[PDB]
């Protein structure tokens, strides 16, 4: 007998994408090879984000892409993101962007190409910068989800701003007792 604890012996991890998409699996294969051989944490990050679940890859905004590219020194670097690149109607001027991504929406692609930009795939990025040179790694906001709005301390505890699960919205839906001092108390 040996006095050790086995509760945390096994670590849950994704050794390959849960997706059955053949192209996603091929990309995971390619970047597993690249990470293993080049030994670059950039390739490791790309592999991990390829194998991640779609929940962890929130959509990215063309406004964020433009902001990243406009910063001093980033004008010529290639922006790499495993998140879908969406179009931002609030963005009026779009600079020249060189982006490698899994998926780019129609409007964002049209605007990027019209502005003189370039869109490539992850394998093309592998051919361009096998070690990730001259890259700007970006992703969408992970905590910006309606589901995440409901996470945290329970709505009925002090100093809690968690969103409750309510059938509807109105004066008749969980707004009387425990929400205002005129009814018992307020938290």
Q: How far is the CB of 170 from RNA (least distance, A)?
A: 7
What does the alpha-carbon distance between residue 154 and residue 164 come to, in Å, rounded to a whole number?
8
List 113, 118, 124, 156, residue binding RNA (CB under 7 A): 156
Establish if 173 lies at the interface with RNA (CB under 7 A).
no
106 contacts: CB under 8 Å, gap ≥ 6? 87
Establish if 172 lies at the interface with RNA (CB under 7 A).
no
What does the alpha-carbon distance between residue 59 and residue 41 come to, in Å, rounded to a whole number?
23
The count of residues interacting with RNA (CB under 7 A) is 97
What does the alpha-carbon distance between residue 139 and residue 69 come to, in Å, rounded to a whole number?
14
Residue 86 phi, psi dihedral angles, 5° rounding? -100, 165
CB of 117 or CB of 140, closer to RNA:
140
Establish if 96 lies at the interface with RNA (CB under 7 A).
no
With CA atoms as reference, report the closest residue to 29 among 13, 46, 54: 46
Mark residues 34-73: x for contact with RNA by CB under 7 A, - for none: --xx--xxx--x--xx-xxxxxx--x---xx--xx-xxxx
Site for RNA in 115-134 (CB under 7 A): 131-134
């Amino acid at each position: 007998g040996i006095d050790i604890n086995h509760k945390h012996d096994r670590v849950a991890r994704r050794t390959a994408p849960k997706s059955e998409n053949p192209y996603l699996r091929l990309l995971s294969k390619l970047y597993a090879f690249l990470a293993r051989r080049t030994g670059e944490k950039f390739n490791a990050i790309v592999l991990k984000r390829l194998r991640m679940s779609r929940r962890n890859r929130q959509p990215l905004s063309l406004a964020k892409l433009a902001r990243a590219v406009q910063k001093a020194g980033n004008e010529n670097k290639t922006v790499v993101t495993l998140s879908t690149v969406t179009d931002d109607a609030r963005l009026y001027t779009v600079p020249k962007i060189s982006v490698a991504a899994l998926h780019v929406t129609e409007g964002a692609r049209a605007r990027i190409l019209a502005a003189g930009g370039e869109i490539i795939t992850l394998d093309q990025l592998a051919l361009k910068s096998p070690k990730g040179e001259n890259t700007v790694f970006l992703q969408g906001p992970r905590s910006a989800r309606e589901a995440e709005k409901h996470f945290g301390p329970a709505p009925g505890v002090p100093h809690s701003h968690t969103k409750p699960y309510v059938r509807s919205k109105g004066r008749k839906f969980e707004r009387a007792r425990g929400r205002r001092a005129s009814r018992a108390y307020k938290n």
